[PDB]
């Protein structure tokens, strides 16, 4: 009977003896799973053909509402996606940081272990805007050589906004289109009118294909102020690929999405650390 | 009792570990606990220690041991109160008036101030016998530094009267003669009611009845120096031979109605939970001893009296697998249990057991000491004539 | 001139020559990161002595603000820490969900794979509170055995409140304290008083020592209404341990937090998916 | 062009891959391209293979090489129209009634059928010259299975032969008798217009005036047997001596307003990208040759004529590091370029370049075959009587 029976209450204090869950699966975080879902849904509704001009971009300003000059402030304390159609984030991180930031990335890009992993490029261009009678055409003109480098109608699909209260900076993630120009004969055409918007981008870039990310340390002087801004573009080949084959190898799309966001972070966090 | 103040961030703290370091003139308060620790009283300790020196005896207070740190801040200038607990953490209490008294004016104090003094207390909850209402309290038993001066290397004796005159006098009287220019007074403070060794008789009689919380007897040595971090051969903690104890899983060995054999084992390696995975498939242990083996080795046998039978008889739960706690009772050598620790998985690692085996023989009863009374009291006079 | 100058247009065929990041580290999530900081700094302010009756419980409810009946609702759409001091979360899952949930768990805690990893436990108790002249004492009486199983002054430190928008349930995380009366029998002398509260709990329990997590599927009848609440506990030794060896092995405190928070999810998510 | 059907599932690809293994008695249809894949032509070959046999020539159609596979499903019964691309991938076209005519009646086709038939093709697009209307079209040059019968191990003459009567005649009749029974037919079918060796003269003079595309001549031996997977030492592909060409990274060795030296370097290892990092720390290459070495060694000088210097003059862009693509004119031995490649990073790996240096010698001008027209015919007239 019972005095004989093996003490089976070897469980009410069994807890004192590391599977990453009671499942052993790693559930996609709340925010991550969106950016995925989102990014995804968005790609879909852009027609197939146009699909090759996917700029998936990520910037840093301060999210600023319709109803204030001051930076936005919900009652939340950890990064979350901020649904407010009125909300507007204008990219512009501080110089003193901008300065310090580039150095870190660059030093960090020539480390003994990250030899064949980072490719740094300086460019100094002129982006010009151009209009009909409405369509808006960007055009690259080099300054040292003066030579059309990228000729597009930049359109815009959807954006996300990432309130980052624990950080000095929020993030607009923009999935938008580079539609190359209709005409067979236009890069010449619009070199007709003195451009109705002109800017100067001394841009320093930082590829890394190991995650499919490329990083931009852009000093733009518009014609009175001059803004310094920071961007993390994702290699459209790979992005289009991991979409192209979702159903099949599903976790390609997941793993590349988070790397994108992990990269979003390291910067955003560092960019917050450097402060003081 | 829940801590008097609170620590600040770790950074704000850090500064102070340092602030103590030179007042002791050793980095030790970086991470090592500056308060002297007491090493278990041995028999070998009578004719070596308790015969060729001098001793003091008060009870081990079971309160929260915290030493006292009082410093004015050339950060921006104020006496801060500080609490230095079991790991090197630093708490900060409200208003205290700690000074000196260089002149005379009973008044003199209201302006004076204590800087960089290190005293040793213990924090109790206190039951006022006439009225029953409780207060928090602080009872201090040693000091190792006075107003920037390092009172470590001093003979206990002095260190104490130095804590008497310089630290208590101001406090107490400032509260007799100005009972209102201090409401900022978070708790209370008194000095530990000391007593010389040969009064174990006069000590022991208290312990059970005192208005606080207390397990044991404490020996502190008169003409011996103090300590910063770590333990010391000369400070002596006494425990009830009883108090010492461990959690014995008991597995039953028996080949049907009255008492059978109850053997008590010690888990080793990692095979307990291992076994638990193959323990639910049970009929009874008979065949399990093949897999039970790599964790359990019985060096014991309890004892169940005929009354002590009629209490485990009506109430039960499955036994062959349980956990028990018990001390080798001295007037037998036999070890009856007083509690079962369901509250834990198993027993204890054998090493961790043998260390407790160690202390039980070295346990020297109250009656093993109330015999030494007249004998330290005979030698200790002899010293006064032989020196 | 130009000819002499090196062909810099080395940018258009530059994508042709899947790391966690452009660092190969994994940046801990913004939530995770903070909960970690919280869980830490908190235990810290709790004295080292009591620090062993520590309870980091996790509860399902609907974060409700003081300014109104409704579930709260800031303008955000991924999970985040809800900073508001009039907000309060009252656990009370839907009975119908609650039924479906336990079976998902009893099921999942018995499949052919997960053998001796899951141990399930029934207790049907009868919790009494008690006064003096203010201290309050929880006392757990059994209903089959009728015997004292937990004698405690459940006292509270801080809570975190986690507004989970994309889900039909929010989360409290209460790291509170489980203070006994010392071993002398007040539970026998506690008749100079009758209780000022009486609940009845048909709690059923799944522990999982392989993460460090117990799942309390708990029916409480009160003495009108009964409430069907759901909680998750973290194996406090494991906790206190990763805490103890902070400074040394960080990794361990970390993966022990996230796997705590990863269990929240599976449930918080499953719970939402079983509406309908 | 765009492929007339689609692939079906991966399993449902595996299934057919199996049927195909057995139909030609080798399971290679697991992976490799069933159809025959030609080897590159040589002067060496002339005496070797075109001298010792009886050979064929047609132009190399530049479509989407796609075999035809027609079988009648022993899953659910009905005829299937299937397509096998360069990677072994299977396409599913709509309505086609592939038959026979074993009896006589001019209806016969309508219930009769084709089973086990593998015929190797080129899917071109097709301009009408009298009208200008373009149309999707499939052309056939060899067949290695007709009506379950493996026509591999048999000579070409007889491989081509059967395919005429067997597959095409009943396609053609069926389409010629009853135009209406089949609009289900998505695209037209025709025989590859075969001609023998001794007609290159008659061939090339047509080569440039064909409605579809043709990037060389292709050569087939009559008397010889076909092949399962991969290459075959007697099936030959002709291309322009000009066709093969490579990307050269142009770098500039120089000491000022009239042309200097333009040395063409080839990237080895993985140092080109690594160059670009410090390339933007330039004035001009003079010093940069230092690291750059790590990725660049040159062999040739280009050739810019005097109405060709003026042309690159007025329009320009930075050069000491662009890329150029050029056939070695066999009339001069040097190599004129016919486009740059901006759209390409470097030039090409030393090894992956070496392999092409080979071919440009192996070619063999058009006349450098034409000259031999009468010498396979003389040598054919000989085999005609010698046997």
Domain CATH number, residue D231? 3.30.470.30
The full length of chain B comes to 387
- In sequence order, the β-bridge partners of residue C80 are C163
According to DSSP, residue C180 is labeled P
What region does B333 belong to: left with phi over 0, alpha with psi -120 to 50, or beta?
left
Same domain? For B207 and B294 the reply is no
Element (H, E) at B376: helix B373-386
Nearest to D146 by CA among D138, D134, D158, D137: D158
Cα B267 to Cα B258: distance, rounded to the nearest angstrom: 28
Contacts of D97 (CB under 8 A, 6+ apart): D79, D109, D110, D174, D181, D182
A22 and C266 within 8 Å at the Cβ level: the answer is: yes
DSSP string, D104-128: --SSGGGT----SEEEEEEEEEEE-
Chain B residues contacting C via beta carbons under 8 Å: 2-3, 6-7, 64, 85-87, 89, 273, 276-277, 280
Contacts of D112 (CB under 8 A, 6+ apart): D99, D100, D101, D102, D170
Domain boundary among D214, D240, D266: D240
- In sequence order, the β-bridge partners of residue B38 are B232
> At which residue do the structure tokens 């501080």 appear?
A94
Phi–psi pair at C2, nearest 5 degrees: -40, -55
Asked whether D192 and D137 are in contact (CB, 8 A), the reply is no
Same domain? For B121 and B228 the reply is yes
> In Å, what is the CA distance from B241 to each residue of B333, B363, B364, B366, C182?
11, 5, 7, 9, 21
Give the distance from CA B207 to its chain's centroid: 14
Domain boundary among D183, D216, D240: D240
Q: Which two tokens stand for residue B125?
A: 């909850």
- At residue B366, the 3 state secondary structure works out as coil
Helix intervals (H) in chain D: 11-23, 43-45, 156-163, 169-177, 200-207, 272-279, 289-292, 306-313, 350-362, 367-370, 374-386
Cα B94 to Cα B184: distance, rounded to the nearest angstrom: 6
> At which residue do the structure tokens 């790991």 appear?
B87
According to DSSP, residue B280 is labeled T
| A170-180 and A151-154 beta bridge pairing | antiparallel
- At residue A160, the 3 state secondary structure works out as strand
- In sequence order, the β-bridge partners of residue A158 are A175
- At residue D214, the 3 state secondary structure works out as strand
Omega before residue A43 within 30° of 0, cis: no
Instruction: State the Cα angle at A207 between A255 and A180, rounded to 5°.
Output: 90
Nearest to C118 by CA among A25, B276, B292: B276
Give the distance from CA B116 to its chain's centroid: 26
Same domain? For D279 and D363 the reply is yes
Instruction: State the Cα angle at D166 between D160 and D169, rounded to 5°.
Output: 95
Asked whether B235 and B156 are in contact (CB, 8 A), the reply is no
Within B215-271, strands assigned E span 217-221, 231-232, 236-238, 246-252, 262-265
Phi–psi pair at B48, nearest 5 degrees: -95, -60
According to DSSP, residue C78 is labeled S
Cα A169 to Cα D126: distance, rounded to the nearest angstrom: 60
> In Å, what is the CA distance from D181 to each residue of D73, D80, D178, D188?
22, 17, 6, 15
> In Å, what is the CA distance from B82 to each residue of B68, B88, B118, B122?
6, 12, 10, 13
> At which residue do the structure tokens 């990014």 appear?
A39
Same domain? For B82 and B180 the reply is yes
Asked whether A233 and A247 are in contact (CB, 8 A), the reply is no
From the candidates B269, B282, B318, B319, which should be mutated to test the interface with A, based on the most A CB atoms within 10 A? B318
Q: Which two tokens stand for residue A202?
A: 């001394």
Q: Which two tokens stand for residue D202?
A: 């008659």
- In sequence order, the β-bridge partners of residue B308 are none
- Known catalytic residue at C57: yes
Q: Which two tokens stand for residue A240?
A: 């289009």
| Contacts D289 to C, Cβ<8 Å | none
The shortest CB-CB distance from C30 to any of A25, A79, A207 is to A79
CA distance A21 to chain B (A): 20
Instruction: Spot the catalytic one: A172, A199, A201, A258.
Output: A201
Same domain? For B170 and B255 the reply is no
Asked whether D55 and D376 are in contact (CB, 8 A), the reply is yes
For residue C122, the tally of other CB atoms under 10 A from its CB is: 9
Rounded CA Rg of chain B: 26
Domain boundary among D175, D208, D240: D240
C6 and D282 within 8 Å at the Cβ level: the answer is: yes
A116 and D276 within 8 Å at the Cβ level: the answer is: no
Same domain? For D209 and D184 the reply is yes
For residue D208, the tally of other CB atoms under 10 A from its CB is: 8
Same domain? For B363 and B373 the reply is yes
Provide the b/e sequence for B139-171 (b: ≥16 CB within 10 Å). bbbbbbbbbeebbbebebeebbebbeebbbebb
The shortest CB-CB distance from B6 to any of C45, C50, C209 is to C45
Cα A272 to Cα D255: distance, rounded to the nearest angstrom: 51
Phi–psi pair at A58, nearest 5 degrees: -150, 120
- In sequence order, the β-bridge partners of residue C217 are C204, C230
| C170-179 and C54-61 beta bridge pairing | antiparallel
Nearest to D264 by CA among D212, D221, D328: D328
C76 and A79 within 8 Å at the Cβ level: the answer is: no
Helix intervals (H) in C46-147: 95-108
| Contacts C12 to D, Cβ<8 Å | 342-343
| D231-237 and D37-40 beta bridge pairing | parallel
- In sequence order, the β-bridge partners of residue A230 are A217
The shortest CB-CB distance from A12 to any of B273, B320, B342 is to B342
Same domain? For B249 and B220 the reply is no
- Quote the number of domains for chain D: 2
Cα C113 to Cα C110: distance, rounded to the nearest angstrom: 8
Same domain? For B95 and B225 the reply is yes
Domains parsed from chain C with CATH numbers:
28-276 (3.20.100.10)
Element (H, E) at B339: strand B337-339
| Contacts C32 to A, Cβ<8 Å | 29
Own/partner long-range contacts of B378-384 (Cβ < 8 Å, ≥24 apart): B379/B51, B380/B54, B380/B197, B380/B198, B383/B54
Instruction: Spot the catalytic one: C59, C126, C172, C201.
Output: C201
Say which CATH number the domain at D269 has.
Answer: 2.40.50.140
Element (H, E) at C126: strand C119-129
A13 and B319 within 8 Å at the Cβ level: the answer is: no
Q: Which two tokens stand for residue B72?
A: 């004015």
Give the distance from CA B243 to its chain's centroid: 12
DSSP string, B300-320: -B----STTTTTTSSS----T
Query: Scanning every residue of chain C, which has its alpha carbon at the shortest distance from the alpha carbon of A234?
Result: C15
Cα B200 to Cα B217: distance, rounded to the nearest angstrom: 9
Same domain? For D22 and D4 the reply is yes
- Known catalytic residue at A67: no
Cα A21 to Cα D306: distance, rounded to the nearest angstrom: 75
Cα C59 to Cα C164: distance, rounded to the nearest angstrom: 12
Asked whether C201 and C127 are in contact (CB, 8 A), the reply is yes
Q: Which two tokens stand for residue B287?
A: 């065949």
The shortest CB-CB distance from B85 to any of C44, C45, C47 is to C47
| Contacts A1 to B, Cβ<8 Å | none
C133 exposure class (CB count in 10 Å sphere: 0-12, 13-18, 19+): exposed
Cα D281 to Cα D270: distance, rounded to the nearest angstrom: 20
Same domain? For B249 and B269 the reply is yes
What region does D78 belong to: left with phi over 0, alpha with psi -120 to 50, or beta?
left
Cα D145 to Cα C41: distance, rounded to the nearest angstrom: 79
User: Half-sphere exposure of residue D295, counting CA atoms within 13 Å on the CB side?
Assistant: 18
CA distance A105 to chain D (A): 14
> At which residue do the structure tokens 């373009």 appear?
D134
Q: Does C49 touch chain B (CB under 8 A)?
A: yes
Cα D13 to Cα D35: distance, rounded to the nearest angstrom: 17
A14 and B276 within 8 Å at the Cβ level: the answer is: yes
Domain that holds residue B126: 1-240
Same domain? For D333 and D201 the reply is no
D318 and C3 within 8 Å at the Cβ level: the answer is: yes
- Known catalytic residue at C154: yes
Cα D383 to Cα D204: distance, rounded to the nearest angstrom: 26
- In sequence order, the β-bridge partners of residue C193 are none
- At residue A112, the 3 state secondary structure works out as coil
Asked whether D312 and D304 are in contact (CB, 8 A), the reply is yes
**Method used experimentally:** X-ray
Helix intervals (H) in B32-155: 45
């Amino acid at each position: 009977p019972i005095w004989a029976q093996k003490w089976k209450p070897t469980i009410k204090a069994l807890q004192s003896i590391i599977d990453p869950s009671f499942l052993n699966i790693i559930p996609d975080d709340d925010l991550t799973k969106s950016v995925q879902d989102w990014v995804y849904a968005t790609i879909y509704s852009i027609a197939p053909e146009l699909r090759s001009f996917i700029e998936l971009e990520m910037k840093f300003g301060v999210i600023i509402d319709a109803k204030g000059p001051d930076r936005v402030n919900p009652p939340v304390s950890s990064q979350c996606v901020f649904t407010e159609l009125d909300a507007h984030l204008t990219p512009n991180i501080d110089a003193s940081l901008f300065k310090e930031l580039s150095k870190y990335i660059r030093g960090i890009s020539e480390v003994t272990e990250n030899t064949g992993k980072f490719s740094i490029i300086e460019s100094q261009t002129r982006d010009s805007v151009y209009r009909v009678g409405p369509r808006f055409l960007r055009m690259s003109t080099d300054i040292k050589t003066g030579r059309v480098g990228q000729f597009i109608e930049k359109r815009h699909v959807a954006q996300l906004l990432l309130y980052s209260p624990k950080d000095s900076y929020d993030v607009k993630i923009s999935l938008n289109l580079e539609l190359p120009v209709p005409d067979n004969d236009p890069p010449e055409k619009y070199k007709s009118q003195s451009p109705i918007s002109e800017r100067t981008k001394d841009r320093v870039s930082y590829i890394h294909n190991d995650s499919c990310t490329r990083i931009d340390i852009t000093k733009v002087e518009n014609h009175s102020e001059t803004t310094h801004e920071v961007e993390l573009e994702i290699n459209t080949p790979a992005l289009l690929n991991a979409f192209d084959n979702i159903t099949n190898d599903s976790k390609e799309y997941a793993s590349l999405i988070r790397t994108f966001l992990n990269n979003g972070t390291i910067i955003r966090r560092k960019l917050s650390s450097l402060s003081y | 009792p829940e801590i008097p103040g609170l620590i600040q961030p770790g950074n704000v703290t850090q500064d102070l570990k340092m602030m103590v370091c030179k007042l002791l003139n050793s980095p030790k308060p970086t991470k090592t606990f500056p308060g002297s620790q007491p090493v278990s009283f041995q028999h070998s300790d009578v004719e070596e220690k308790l015969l060729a020196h001098d001793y003091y005896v008060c009870e081990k207070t079971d309160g929260l041991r915290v030493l006292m740190f009082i410093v004015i801040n050339p950060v921006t200038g104020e006496q801060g109160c500080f609490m230095i607990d079991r790991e090197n953490n630093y708490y900060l209490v409200n208003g205290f008036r700690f000074p000196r008294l260089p002149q005379k004016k009973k008044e003199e104090l209201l302006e004076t101030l204590q800087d960089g003094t290190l005293l040793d207390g213990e924090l109790v909850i206190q039951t006022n016998p006439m009225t029953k209402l409780q207060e928090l309290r602080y009872l201090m038993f040693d000091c190792l530094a006075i107003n920037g001066r390092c009172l470590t290397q001093s003979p206990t004796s002095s260190r104490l009267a130095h804590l008497g005159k310089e630290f208590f006098k101001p406090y107490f009287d400032l509260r007799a003669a100005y009972p209102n220019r201090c409401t900022t007074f978070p708790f209370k403070i008194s000095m530990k009611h000391m007593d010389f060794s040969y009064q174990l008789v006069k000590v022991a009689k208290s312990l059970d009845k005192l208005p606080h919380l207390s397990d044991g007897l404490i020996f502190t040595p008169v003409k011996a120096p103090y300590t910063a971090g770590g333990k010391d051969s000369l400070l002596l903690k006494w425990k009830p031979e009883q108090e010492n104890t461990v959690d014995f899983k008991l597995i039953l060995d028996i080949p049907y109605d009255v008492k059978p054999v109850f053997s008590l084992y010690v888990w080793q390696g990692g095979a307990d939970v291992n076994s638990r995975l193959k323990h639910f498939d049970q009929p009874f242990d008979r065949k399990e001893f093949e897999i039970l083996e790599r964790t359990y080795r019985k060096f014991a046998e309890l004892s169940v009296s005929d009354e002590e039978w009629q209490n485990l008889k009506n109430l039960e739960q499955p036994l062959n697998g349980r956990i028990v706690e018990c001390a080798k009772n001295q007037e037998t050598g036999a070890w009856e249990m007083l509690r079962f620790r369901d509250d834990k998985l198993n027993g204890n690692h054998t090493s961790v057991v043998q260390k407790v085996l160690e202390s039980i023989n070295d346990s020297v009863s109250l009656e093993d000491l109330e015999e030494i009374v007249g004998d330290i009291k005979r030698c200790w006079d002899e010293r006064r004539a032989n020196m």
